[model samples]
Target: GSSGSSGPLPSTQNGPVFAKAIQKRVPCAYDKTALALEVGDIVKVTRMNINGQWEGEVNGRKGLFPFTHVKIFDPQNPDENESGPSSG
Candidate 1:
């Protein structure tokens, strides 16, 4: 079920790098071609812009977002999850 066709174009087999959006972000409030990157959502990155932004596509919609807003997908280490808190 993970291989659905909600994709934009070719993935790692070609160009676009896969990434998942992180909620910890607050880019410029005024944007035109910028995407409202959803938290915990998958996005395909076109590439990193020189202006400290990443051109990514969330589903079919494409736009710019702060690079730090999304954790670049690392196939080498798939341990991006965190689980540590004060036990009540």
Candidate 2:
């Protein structure tokens, strides 16, 4: 039986990059709209922000988390999982 709605959104269909949380993270009040992640949880990368945080979706919740905390990967391409896009 299905227990949760942890699917990607329409906008996340293209490119479709994802990440694995290496550490536990909690968003601040200003960006309370972010998602919480566990050590092994997978997050869908929506985009990158100017502050070096990745706007990602986890378990269907959207939020901004430090890019350094995740190991980004592409579902269609597993070879490039170790290293990912860089942001300033």
Candidate 3:
């Protein structure tokens, strides 16, 4: 599915997003900012610009998603994240 207009946003533009955990959720501070969610973290979307609270189960345990507080991952190319820490 398109993921309810909440799927990958325009900024994704084919960029690399943090891999979500399996069956986990995370909460946004309702501050409309991106996060560094690791696997097994549970979170909730406390607020949204148009909608209110949104919730879902994330892969690897990363949690809740709100449109405003997320950003499309566009760091280096796919080759980098998989490389060593020195690559960053």
Largest lDDT belongs to which candidate? Answer: 2
Q: Distance from true position, residue 3, model 1, in Å? A: 48
Residue 88 of model 1 has an lDDT of: 23
How does model 2 fare in lDDT? 0.75
Candidate 3 residue-wise lDDT, 24-78, digit = tens: 2334567333333444544433323355334433433323354444443433457
The CA lDDT of each predicted structure is 0.69, 0.75, 0.40
- Candidate 1 has a TM-score of 0.53
All models, RMSD in angstroms: 11.2, 13.0, 11.6
Summarize candidate 1's per-residue lDDT along 1-88 as a digit string, tens digits.
5876676756555466777777744336786677776678877776766778777776577787776777776644638655578632
TM accuracy, model 2: 0.56
Off by over 4 Å in 2: 1-14, 28-31, 74-88
Clashes of 3: 18
Following a full C-alpha superposition, what root-mean-square deviation does model 1 have from the true structure? 11.2
Worst 10 residues of 3 by lDDT: 15-24
Of candidate 2, the 10-residue stretch with the lowest lDDT total is 79-88
- Residue-pair clashes per prediction, in order, are 0, 1, 18
Clash list (residue pairs), candidate 2: 34-63
